[PDB]
Amino acid sequence: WSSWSPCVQGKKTRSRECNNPPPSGGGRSCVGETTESTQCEDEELEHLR
Amino acid sequence: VFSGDGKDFYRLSGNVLSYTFQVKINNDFNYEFYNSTWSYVKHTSTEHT
Amino acid sequence: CFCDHYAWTQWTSCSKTCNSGTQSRHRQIVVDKYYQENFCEQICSKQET
Secondary structure (H helix, E strand, O other), X not given: XXXXXXXXXXXXEEEOOOOOOXXXXXXXXXOOOOEEOOEOOHHHHHHHO | OEEOOOOEEOOXXXXXXXXXXXXXXXXXXXXXXXOOOOOOOXXXXXXXX | OOHHHOOOOOOOOOOOOOOOOOOOEEOOXXXXXXXXXXXXXXXXXXXXX
């Protein structure tokens, strides 16, 4: 993963793009999702305290 | 529980949600074989008087 | 015929990369007096799929 982008509207993002030697010779595409987005950590900081 | 396999009684903890004593055995075999053989002969002669 | 005379080619890149796909190979058939006389055209499979 490219390290998580700073938060917008309570969510991060991150991207991985199969940048190792690509699916080749008719081989199947990389098994997974290119991008993820996840909710931010601010609820720990506010709530558990 | 009485185990129907190894033929014995056993004690279970409250940490285990279920200890069942079902049996399953699943087998898959693949056997694949090749053999080959050849022989060949050539002769020539060229002659005069 | 000794059909094992002819080429152990690699299998072709998988036609559909990840679903119900197929691959094939062929003997690299070169015709000769041997091939014509020893029933090779009759008994040998030219391509495997």
